RNA sequence: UACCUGGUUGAUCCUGCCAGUAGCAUAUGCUUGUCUCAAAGAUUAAGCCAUGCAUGUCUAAGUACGCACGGCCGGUACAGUGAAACUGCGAAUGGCUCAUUAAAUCAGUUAUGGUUCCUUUGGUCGCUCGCUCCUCUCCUACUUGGAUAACUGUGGUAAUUC
RNA sequence: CCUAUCAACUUUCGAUGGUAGUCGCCGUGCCUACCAUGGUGACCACGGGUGACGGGGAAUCAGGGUUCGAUUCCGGAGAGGGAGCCUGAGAAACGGCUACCACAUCCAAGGAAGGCAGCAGGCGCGCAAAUUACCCACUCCCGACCCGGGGAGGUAGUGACGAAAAAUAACAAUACAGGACUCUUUCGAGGCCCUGUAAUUGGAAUGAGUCCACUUUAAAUCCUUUAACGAGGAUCCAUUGGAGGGCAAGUCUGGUCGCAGCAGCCGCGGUAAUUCCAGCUCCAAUAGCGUAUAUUAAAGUUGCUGCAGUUAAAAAGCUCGUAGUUGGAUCUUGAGGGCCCGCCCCUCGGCGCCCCCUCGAUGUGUCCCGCGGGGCCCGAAGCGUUUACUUUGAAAAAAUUAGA
C-alpha cells in the first residue's frame, strides 16, 4: 500500500542543493504546493533561519510568519514552507531589504541582495502561450502566472517582465540568438552565458549549444536553459562564486586566501 | 551511523621475525601494543595505494593534479614529508618510523619534561602539558609543524605553575602529616 | 573571575527586536561563571537590565579556562515574551510548561469519544479510576 | 600485503583432496577500569495476544439561548470570555513488516495526442447578452422556506464508543 | 535465481487478431456479439522449484572476480485469511464497515462487541534480540491553528553486535649483571647511559572511586569544568588460549602409563610421556581473547583473464549433418611556421547565376552580390548503402563510497 500521496519528506532524501545537513535531523521542511516543482524549490524556513539565521527553533519560525513582515513577489505570505523558486524575490518590509534567489555555479542558492528598483520586476520565460477559451489569448509563465491579453507578436521562449506592484506584462524581451541565459540543473548548474546556436531536432528533446563567458562550450537540453534577458545586458547582477564557472583548484586558492584575512 | 576500524590484521598470525620487529618498534617509540603498530600500517598502506593510483593516471589531468597536491600538502603539514622532495615517487619510500617520529610523545621526549619514551606517554596521559592553551591527553596524535613550538607545561599540573590540585598538597602533607605526625 | 564577554557573530535583529550574539567567556583555569552572573554582567554593557536577557547553550572547554555559550538581549520584555520558546523561559524559572501531565489528557480524550454532548460527565468518568 | 604451509611413501617427483591459516556475522564460553559513537524479536510461528497508549482540530472572523463564569451596557439581534454541539478539514498520510509475487514486483530510460486530480499559486466572479424584458408586471431584495443536534425532560437494555 | 529425471505450449469458461458495441477516471479481448486462425518456443519458451520483495547500496578479491541486500533511504506489496462496500479529489482502509472462514472475548443465554507484520509488554518459538519508563522542548506533520494533539519523533534505561581513545604506574638513589670513554702490561678500578632484581624510599604525578560549586537538559542523567580527598606495594592487585609437528613457546618437575585424557589434521599415551593430568616457567594477542557455524580469501581445487583429459579423475565406435558458433584475398586523400591544416591520381554557409529592401556605378530601385531574407547550385556538404565499435555531450537520487 500507498493509498494516497505523502505529506511528509524525510531528510537525507531531500535535494542536495538546498544545503541541509545529513542525519542530525530526521525530517526536512518539504515545500508546500505552489507555482514551482518541489525539486527546484527552497522552503522559506531554510532561507530565513539556516542562511539568514533569525530563528533557533521552529516555534519562532511560525511566530515570525504571523507578523506578516514578509512579502514574496509583492504579495503577503504567511506560509512557513513557501515554495520559492528561480528569480523569486523575497521582500522584508521591516528592514527594506530585497533578496532574490539565483544559482551559484557552485550549485548553492545565493543570498543576493538587490535594490528595490530591481525588485519591482522579474523576468519570466514563457512556458506556453495559449489561445484560450472564446478566442482570448493568454501567456503562461514558468511560475504559473497567466496574464490575459498579452503583446500580439510574442512567440515561445520569450521573456517577459512581470511586475509585482500591479501584475501584468510591463514590456517584454524578444527571444533571439546570443541572449543571456542561465543554465539551471544538470552538470551545467548555475553557469551563465550567451546562446550561439539552438539545434532543432523534430520529435522530443532539442538541444541548445551554449558558450559561457569564459569560452567553455557545452550543450544542454532546451528545458535546462532559462532565458534571463537580452544578450550582454544583465538585469540582475552576478552572484558569488563567479556564477560563471570556476575550477576546484582556483576555488581552493580563493578559500584559503580570503580566510584569516577578514576581520 | 557508520564506523570503521583504524587497524589491520595480517594474514599470518605467527611469523616470529616480524613479531620481534614489531616489539622493537614498540620499544623505540614507547607504544602500548601491536595494535598501535597496526594502526600506522593501515594508514601507510592506504597512502602508498593513493600515491600509486595517481602515478598511473595520465599527467596534466585535474584529478591527478588536485589530489596529488592535497596528499603532498597534508604530509608536509604534519612534518612526515619534506617539500624539497615532493612527489609520488618519494611518498612510496616512507615507512612506519617516519610517522611515529612526529607524534606528540616523541616531541615531549625531544624537548620538555620527559626523561624517556616511557615517561613522555605517562606525562601526556596525566595532562602535564598544553599544546598551546589546549590540553592534549592523547599521546598518539601527530603534531603539525608549528604545533611543536607551543608544547609547554599546563596550568593544571601545579608544578610548572598552576592551581594546587591534591597531588602537590599530598606532598605538602608528607611534611605536615608524614613528618607532622598528624 | 577575570572574565570579559567577547561577542562573536553579532546580529542586529530588527524584525525580532533583539541583539543576538555568541558569548565567549575566557576564564583563568575554571570554565564557567554562573548563568545569572553572565546576565548581570552583560546587562550593564548594553544597559537593558538582566531581566530581558536570556542565556543558554554553554559547554566547558577541556582543561578549563574557556566556556562558549550564547545570549540574547531583548530590547523590551514584550519582545522576549513574543518569540518565546518554552524551554528558554523554563531554563531560569519564570514560566514552565504543562504539568497535567500527559496521560491524564489521553484518558480524558478517550472518555469524550464514548458519548455525544455532556462535557462534565466525561470528566467525572476519567476521575474515578486512579488505578 | 599478489603470499601458502602440514598429511599418500622405504625414500623420491607428480596428480589430488583434506587439515591448518586471515577476513567477516551471528551464536556461545570466559574476563572486563574510564571516555565517546549505536546495531538490536529478520531467521524460528506475516504465530497468538491481558493492560496502557499511538490523531485530532478555532481564528476579532461559519454557527452560542451552557446548569457556565464575569458585567451595568441593554434591545435593533446583542455582549467580554466560553465547556459543549453542528459545520468544514485531517483520519488514504504516519508508523510497521517483507509473507506474497520470476518480466510479475522493481530499476533505469521513455509516454499520456488514452486520462483523473482536493489543495496551493496565477487568471476566471453583475445579465436572463431584453423569451425583438416574464427578470418595469416573475413586485421577497431593506433577504424566502422549514428541521435536528447540543439543551431540557421522560426512558429502555444481564451486558454495547448500544 | 535454479531446473530437460520439465520439450512443445496457449481458447471452449478468449488463446492471438479484425470489426462494432457494452463498460471503465481514461487506452485495451476490459467484456461481448460476429468474423478470422492466430500467438509462442532449442536465442530454453511452456511447466516446476524458491527463507524470490526490488533498487541505491554492503563484505572480500593483485587485477579478473565471488558473495550479500527483511534490516536508518527510495519504490512496490500486505496489515488473522478471503470476498464485497461506504465516505472522499485520493482508500477496496482492520487504532472504518459488512458477510463468511479460521481464531479469541463477554453473556443473566435473548444477545453483544474484536484484530499489536503500531509503541511498550506478555505468551509461544528458538542458538538469538531491550523500558509494561519520561516528553511534545527539539526535528517535522496535521487542524479552524503561533497557541492544540502526536509510541511520528525526541529523551533516558537495557546494550563487550561492532567501532573510537588506550589506563591499571612513571623517575631517581643504592645493592648488583653488563658496553662505548679513561687509567693500568693485563688483572683490576674509575666512568655516563641506565635495564632488570633487592631493600625500601624520596619528592613528583593522575583519575578509577569520592564531591560543595559552575555547566548539561523539556526537566534530568552522563560527559566536557572544578574547591576538598584518593598509589612505595604479594598494591587502586587483567585476561584468554597455546608451548611434539603445521605453530610463535618446556632435550620442563611431579603424577599417571594405550588408563584417564589429548587429537580440525598428522599423531601422542602400552613406565625413564618435551603432546595427557596438575604445578612451574615461557610464548601470542592484550580489555579483550577462546569456541561453534555460514560465507569470502588463499584455490589456476570451476581455471573469462587463467585449468586438466597418452599413462594420475576425463575424447562419444565411427561418419554424415541442421540449429549454433566460426570463416580467404581485393575498392585513391602543395603551401605557413618550426608536427599542423582543408584537398587530391540548399533548412545553412557560400564560388556564382537570377529576385527583392538594395551595398559601392544608384538612393517599389542596377550591371560588382546573396553579403540580410530567397530560389537554383559548386570547393564544402546529406553526397554514395547500412551499422556495430570507438569518441564528445546531455539525461544521469541524497546518504553510502572514493575524495577536496
Curated annotation (Swiss-Prot), chain A:
Top-level taxon in the UniProt lineage: Eukaryota
Every S4 RNA-binding domain range: 42-104
Cellular component, GO annotation: cytosolic ribosome; cytosolic small ribosomal subunit; nucleolus
Residues annotated with N6-acetyllysine modification: 233
Single GO MF descriptor: structural constituent of ribosome
Protein name (Swiss-Prot/TrEMBL): Small ribosomal subunit protein eS4
Presence of the UniProt keyword Ubl conjugation in the record: yes
Species the sequence originates in: Oryctolagus cuniculus (Rabbit)
Lineage summary: Eukaryota, Metazoa, Chordata, Craniata, Vertebrata
Gene name of this polypeptide: RPS4X
InterPro entries, per the entry: KOW, Rib_uL2_dom2, Ribosomal_eS4, Ribosomal_eS4_C, Ribosomal_eS4_central_region, Ribosomal_eS4_central_sf, Ribosomal_eS4_KOW, Ribosomal_eS4_N
From Swiss-Prot, chain B:
SUPFAM superfamilies the UniProt entry points to: Alpha-L RNA-binding motif
Modification Phosphoserine occurs at: 147, 157
Cellular component, GO, one term: cytosolic ribosome
Domain S4 RNA-binding: 102-176
Region (Disordered): 156-182
GO biological process terms, semicolon-separated: ribosomal small subunit biogenesis; translation
Crosslink (Glycyl lysine isopeptide (Lys-Gly) (interchain with G-Cter in SUMO2)) position: 87, 133
Keyword Amino-acid biosynthesis (UniProt): no
Keyword annotations of the record: Acetylation, Cytoplasm, Isopeptide bond, Nucleus, Phosphoprotein, Ribonucleoprotein, Ribosomal protein, RNA-binding, rRNA-binding, Ubl conjugation
Modified residues (N6-acetyllysine): 60, 110, 149
Disulfide bonds: none
Keyword Oxidoreductase: no
Record-linked PROSITE patterns: RIBOSOMAL_S4 (PS00632), S4 (PS50889)
GO molecular function: rRNA binding; structural constituent of ribosome
Subcellular location field: Cytoplasm; Nucleus, Nucleolus
Family the entry assigns: Belongs to the universal ribosomal protein uS4 family.
Quaternary context: Component of the small ribosomal subunit. Identified in a IGF2BP1-dependent mRNP granule complex containing untranslated mRNAs. Part of the small subunit (SSU) processome, composed of more than 70 proteins and the RNA chaperone small nucleolar RNA (snoRNA) U3.
Function statement: Component of the small ribosomal subunit. The ribosome is a large ribonucleoprotein complex responsible for the synthesis of proteins in the cell. Part of the small subunit (SSU) processome, first precursor of the small eukaryotic ribosomal subunit. During the assembly of the SSU processome in the nucleolus, many ribosome biogenesis factors, an RNA chaperone and ribosomal proteins associate with the nascent pre-rRNA and work in concert to generate RNA folding, modifications, rearrangements and cleavage as well as targeted degradation of pre-ribosomal RNA by the RNA exosome.
Protein name: Small ribosomal subunit protein uS4
Organism annotation: Oryctolagus cuniculus (Rabbit)
Phylogenetic lineage: Eukaryota, Metazoa, Chordata, Craniata, Vertebrata
Amino acid at each position: 500500500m500507498a493509498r494516497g500521496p505523502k505529506k511528509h519528506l524525510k531528510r537525507v532524501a531531500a535535494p542536495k542543493h538546498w544545503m541541509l545537513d545529513k542525519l542530525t535531523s530526521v525530517f526536512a521542511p518539504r515545500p508546500s504546493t505552489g507555482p514551482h516543482k518541489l525539486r527546484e524549490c527552497l522552503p522559506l524556513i531554510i532561507f530565513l533561519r539556516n542562511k539568514l539565521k533569525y530563528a533557533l527553533t521552529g516555534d519562532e519560525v511560525k511566530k515570525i510568519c504571523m507578523q506578516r513582515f514578509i512579502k514574496i513577489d509583492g504579495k503577503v505570505r504567511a506560509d512557513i514552507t513557501y515554495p520559492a523558486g528561480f528569480m523569486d524575490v523575497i521582500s522584508i518590509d521591516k528592514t527594506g531589504e530585497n533578496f532574490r534567489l539565483i544559482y551559484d555555479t557552485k550549485g548553492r542558492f545565493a543570498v543576493h541582495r538587490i535594490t528595490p528598483e530591481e525588485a519591482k520586476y522579474k523576468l519570466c520565460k514563457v512556458r506556453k502561450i495559449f489561445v484560450g477559451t472564446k478566442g482570448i489569448p493568454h501567456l503562461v509563465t514558468h511560475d504559473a502566472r497567466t496574464i490575459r491579453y498579452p503583446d500580439p507578436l510574442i512567440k515561445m521562449n520569450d521573456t517577459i517582465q512581470i511586475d509585482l506592484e500591479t501584475g501584468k506584462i510591463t514590456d517584454f524581451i524578444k527571444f533571439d540568438t546570443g541572449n543571456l541565459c542561465m543554465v539551471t540543473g544538470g552538470a551545467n548548474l548555475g553557469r551563465i552565458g550567451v546562446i550561439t546556436n539552438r539545434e532543432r531536432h523534430p520529435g522530443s528533446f532539442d538541444v541548445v549549444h551554449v558558450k559561457d563567458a569564459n569560452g567553455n562550450s557545452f550543450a544542454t537540453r532546451l528545458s535546462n536553459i532559462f532565458v534571463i534577458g537580452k544578450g550582454n545586458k544583465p538585469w540582475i547582477s552576478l552572484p558569488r562564486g563567479k556564477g560563471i564557472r570556476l575550477t576546484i583548484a582556483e576555488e581552493r586558492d580563493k578559500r584559503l586566501a580570503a580566510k584569516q584575512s577578514s576581520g | 551511523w557508520v564506523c570503521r576500524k583504524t587497524y589491520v590484521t595480517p594474514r599470518r598470525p605467527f611469523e616470529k621475525s616480524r613479531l620481534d620487529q614489531e616489539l622493537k618498534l614498540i620499544g623505540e617509540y614507547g607504544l602500548r601494543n601491536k595494535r598501535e603498530v597496526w594502526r600506522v600500517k593501515f594508514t601507510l598502506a592506504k597512502i602508498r595505494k593513493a600515491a600509486r593510483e595517481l602515478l598511473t593516471l595520465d599527467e596534466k589531468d585535474p584529478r591527478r593534479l588536485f589530489e596529488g597536491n592535497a596528499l603532498l600538502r597534508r604530509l608536509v603539514r604534519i612534518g612526515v614529508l619534506d617539500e624539497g622532495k615532493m612527489k609520488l615517487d618519494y611518498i612510496l619510500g616512507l615507512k612506519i618510523e617516519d610517522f611515529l617520529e612526529r607524534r606528540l610523545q616523541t616531541q615531549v621526549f625531544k624537548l620538555g619534561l620527559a626523561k624517556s619514551i616511557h615517561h613522555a606517554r605517562v606525562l601526556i596521559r596525566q595532562r602535564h602539558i598544553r599544546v598551546r592553551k589546549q590540553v592534549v591527553n592523547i599521546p598518539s596524535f601527530i603534531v603539525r609543524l608549528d604545533s611543536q613550538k607551543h608544547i609547554d607545561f599546563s596550568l593544571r599540573s601545579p608544578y610548572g605553575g598552576g592551581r594546587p590540585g591534591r597531588v602537590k598538597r599530598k606532598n605538602a602533607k608528607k611534611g605536615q602529616g608524614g613528618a607532622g605526625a598528624g | 573571575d577575570t572574565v570579559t564577554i567577547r561577542t562573536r557573530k553579532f546580529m542586529t535583529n530588527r524584525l525580532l527586536q533583539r541583539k543576538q550574539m555568541v558569548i565567549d567567556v575566557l576564564h583563568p583555569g575554571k570554565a564557567t561563571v554562573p548563568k545569572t552572573e553572565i546576565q548581570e554582567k552583560l546587562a550593564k554593557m548594553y544597559k537593558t537590565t538582566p531581566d530581558v536577557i536570556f542565556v543558554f547553550g554553554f559547554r566547558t572547554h577541556f582543561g578549563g579556562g574557556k566556556t562558549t555559550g550564547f545570549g540574547m538581549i531583548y530590547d523590551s520584555l514584550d519582545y522576549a515574551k513574543k518569540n518565546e520558546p518554552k524551554h528558554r523561559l523554563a531554563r531560569h524559572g519564570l514560566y514552565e510548561k504543562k504539568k497535567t501531565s500527559r496521560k491524564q489528557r489521553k484518558e480524558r480524550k478517550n472518555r469524550m469519544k464514548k458519548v455525544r454532548g455532556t462535557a462534565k460527565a466525561n470528566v467525572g468518568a476519567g476521575k474515578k479510576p486512579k488505578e
